[PDB]
Amino acid sequence: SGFRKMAFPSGKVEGCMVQVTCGTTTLNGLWLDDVVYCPRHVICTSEDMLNPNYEDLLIRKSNHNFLVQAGNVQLRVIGHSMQNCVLKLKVDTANPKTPKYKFVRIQPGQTFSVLACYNGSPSGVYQCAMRPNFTIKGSFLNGSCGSVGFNIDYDCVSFCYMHHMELPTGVHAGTDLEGNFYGPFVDRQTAQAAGTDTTITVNVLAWLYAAVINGDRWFLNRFTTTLNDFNLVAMKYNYEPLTQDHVDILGPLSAQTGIAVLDMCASLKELLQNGMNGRTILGSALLEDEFTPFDVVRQCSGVTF
Amino acid sequence: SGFRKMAFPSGKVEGCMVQVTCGTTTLNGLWLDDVVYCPRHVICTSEDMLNPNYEDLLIRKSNHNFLVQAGNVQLRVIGHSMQNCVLKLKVDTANPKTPKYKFVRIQPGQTFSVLACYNGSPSGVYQCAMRPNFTIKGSFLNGSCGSVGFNIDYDCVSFCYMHHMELPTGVHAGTDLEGNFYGPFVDRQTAQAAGTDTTITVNVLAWLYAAVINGDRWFLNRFTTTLNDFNLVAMKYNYEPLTQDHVDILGPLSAQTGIAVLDMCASLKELLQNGMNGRTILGSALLEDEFTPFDVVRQCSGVTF
Ligand SMILES: *[C@](O)(C(=O)NC)[C@H](CC[C@H](C)F)NC(=O)[C@@H]1[C@H]2CCC[C@H]2CN1C(=O)[C@@H](NC(=O)OC)C(C)(C)C
Ligand SMILES: *[C@](O)(C(=O)NC)[C@H](CC[C@H](C)F)NC(=O)[C@@H]1[C@H]2CCC[C@H]2CN1C(=O)[C@@H](NC(=O)OC)C(C)(C)C
């Protein structure tokens, strides 16, 4: 038993991390087969940043201007191109540690692990969610740009995030591995504010199921609710609507515990309207929304990779 | 900015994880050079467990009875011995992925990462603290025995924990890599209860410094306290005494923020006596005690490995 915020094992991603330097700027890149992916702003100084013309800056670079280091070893760059907000540096050596991988654009509410890196060297790993407002609540210092987020399914690493920016209040924005930002954000140092965030209702329910599985049952009430009536309450408390798809996705946890989803919704409604009254659930004094149903099953069933 | 519970990158440990089977029992082992370390209870059935005589059970085993698998590959066992609560299986192949390593017995209050594993395959990684009562609040399912806890210092993996048991209320007990339990516990299925736990005061202070560094300052008051007067309050709230060593260890964070440790102690005293009043600190509605001062510096300074 027990329940922790649990990241994927990071080894398969660690073997892909490199350092990319262009001029004065150094950040991280991702080396897969014979391509290194990194944020396009490696080609900028911190005066280009107010509004860089990246296409223009890149035309004045050539392959040799990119210093790519995998540990101690320089990798010779033999081609380069820009795809949205990422650069692809073709190198003359394929990474022998490349795992089976895919690039995937994740949906808001889904979780992933971040391997935070500096100068191509991993610092730590932690689990995040893509927030409904397309930011992530990460932990990043200057030098972490190009760090990636990912999920692992058996042997296959699905890369979903590359770090680019920090927005006001210490939240983070970035791209998929095709270089397309999540959310309305752009890679320039200009006033941009995230939309107002919302709580990921299906994930809160998943975490209440995790609590039940772990024997922390105190909040289960004797009632039920309709989907529509629950959503009227979710709206008031800035929770996202619960859909029938969400109900179906919660099916495995509902079956395991014998608690119908709409019964769990009645218990969550009471928690929203009345509070926790100083009690905890799974050691938390707030309702947690960064565990997906799959995260709960994986952690409560021992899924390995 | 940002602050997350952050585990060490797990790759160097993943490359050491194997499966060990003896008879009906399968669990995880740690393969370093030509030795596999695992819990001695691999030689038990789940009837031996009330009170096994491990020395006696082991005399009736020979090398070939231990099936050790590293991924797809069986490793031939050529020697075995017992050291306290761990078995050491000598194998005929040295692990080529062995990192620089040490075995270290950590002190209560210190943190480490756990790589949870099943059938020799890693499932996830998370950060824990050794509690003052010598348990850890982990996340472990049957099959996770032999999973290890560790810290990384640049290139060197310091292994500090191997998982053996779960105690009432879903907390966990285990050994160092010399097989000596943390705490009074024994590897048998007999009534054992942890001592009453306490809150790790120096770590709470470290986390308040992390909050200040991240701009979450609301709880800083205008006062100071003496060490003695603070400890009288810590005692009442089941917090461990703060020592001068702790004050000195907090020096780097105090210097960074300009807040003297005893001034931060006055702010913590007020939080203990008055509560948070529904506010959060670093996104938490409770005071967090599983970040050490070093954890805060590492995460707020970008230390890599
Ligand atoms: C990376 O570029 C990096 O690590 N480089 C070595 C950094 C990481 C900063 C934090 C830790 F996330 N990101 C930037 O500095 C980006 C930069 C590229 C896109 C536009 C440029 C500014 N920038 C920012 O994050 C700014 N954010 C901002 O303008 O938001 C509207 C701030 C944080 C520098 C003000
Ligand atoms: C490991 O042995 C394992 O994973 N084996 C495949 C397990 C892990 C159990 C949980 C997830 F931690 N541990 C045990 O079952 C141990 C076992 C070895 C030492 C004594 C034996 C009982 N045991 C327990 O953890 C029991 N704890 C207990 O007796 O505490 C006083 C319980 C949890 C099985 C009752």
Note the ligand closest to the C-alpha atom of B54: 2
Residue B53: CB partners within 8 Å, gap ≥ 6?
none
Q: What is the CATH architecture of A1-14+100-197?
A: Beta Barrel (2.40)
Nearest CA in chain A to B275: A278
> Which tokens sit at B305?
């490995």
CA distances from B122 to A14, A44, A110, B117 (A): 15, 39, 21, 4
- CA A183 to chain centroid: 13
What's the reported resolution, in angstroms, to a tenth?
A: 1.4
Nearest Cα residue to B159 out of B264, B86, B215, B220: B86
Superfamily of domain A15-99: Trypsin-like serine proteases (2.40.10.10)
The single-letter code of the amino acid at A157 is V
- Select A198-301's CATH number: 1.10.1840.10, 1.20.200.10, 3.40.50.880, 1.10.760.10: 1.10.1840.10
Q: Is-catalytic flag, B156?
A: no
Per-domain boundaries in chain A: 1-14+100-197, 15-99, 198-301
Give chain A positions within 8 Å (CB) of B19. Answer: none
Q: Give the Cα separation of B121 and A305 in Å (integer).
A: 6
Among the partner-chain residues B5, B126, B214, the one whose CB lies closest to the CB of A170 is: B214
User: DSSP class of residue B294?
Assistant: H
CA distances from A198 to A181, A275, A284, B74 (A): 19, 18, 19, 50
Place of tokens 């101690």: A72
Nearest Cα residue to A146 out of A167, A127, A171, A165: A165
C-beta of residue A210 within 8 angstroms of C-beta of residue A299: yes
Distance B291 CA to ligand 1 centre (A): 26
CB burial of residue B217 (10 Å; 0-12, 13-18, 19+): middle
C-beta of residue B295 within 8 angstroms of C-beta of residue B288: no
Q: Give the Cα separation of B264 and A258 in Å (integer).
A: 48
**Domain pair B1-14+100-197 / B15-99, same fold:** yes
Classify B111 in phi/psi space as left (phi over 0), alpha (psi -120 to 50) or beta: beta
Strand partners, A100: A156
Nearest CA in chain B to A138: B2
> Which tokens sit at B184?
């009074």
Residue B26: CB partners within 8 Å, gap ≥ 6?
B19, B20, B42, B119, B143
- Ligand 1 environment, Cβ below 6 A: A 27, 41, 49, 140-145, 164-167, 172, 187-189, 192
Phi and psi torsions of A268, nearest 5°: -65, -40
Instruction: Name the method of structure determination.
Output: X-ray
Strand partners, A191: none
Residue with CA at minimum distance from ligand 1 atom 11? A141
CA distances from A144 to A112, B56, B146, B212, B215 (A): 17, 54, 33, 21, 20
Alpha helices in B7-157 (DSSP H): 11-14, 54-59
Nearest Cα residue to A117 out of A24, A23, A31, A4: A31
The radius of gyration of chain A's CA atoms, rounded to the nearest angstrom, is 22
Q: Give the Cα separation of B234 and B41 in Å (integer).
A: 40
The single-letter code of the amino acid at A99 is P
Note the ligand closest to the C-alpha atom of A48: 1
Nearest Cα residue to A254 out of A284, A289, A224, A287: A224
C-beta of residue A42 within 8 angstroms of C-beta of residue A20: yes
> Which tokens sit at A290?
């960064």
Residue B152 Cβ inside 6 Å of ligand 2? The answer reads: no
Place of tokens 């938490």: B284
- Could you identify the atom of ligand 1 that is nearest to the CA of residue A192? 31
- Could you identify the atom of ligand 2 that is nearest to the CA of residue B41? 18
Distance B289 CA to ligand 2 centre (A): 27
Q: Kindly report the CA angle at A115 between B27 and B12, in degrees rounded to 5?
A: 40
Choice among B16, B22, B38, B41 that is catalytic: B41
Query: Which is it for the CA torsion B200, B205, B207, B208, positive or negative?
Result: positive
Best residue for ligand 1 mutational test, from A140, A145, A185 (most atoms within 8 Å of Cβ): A145
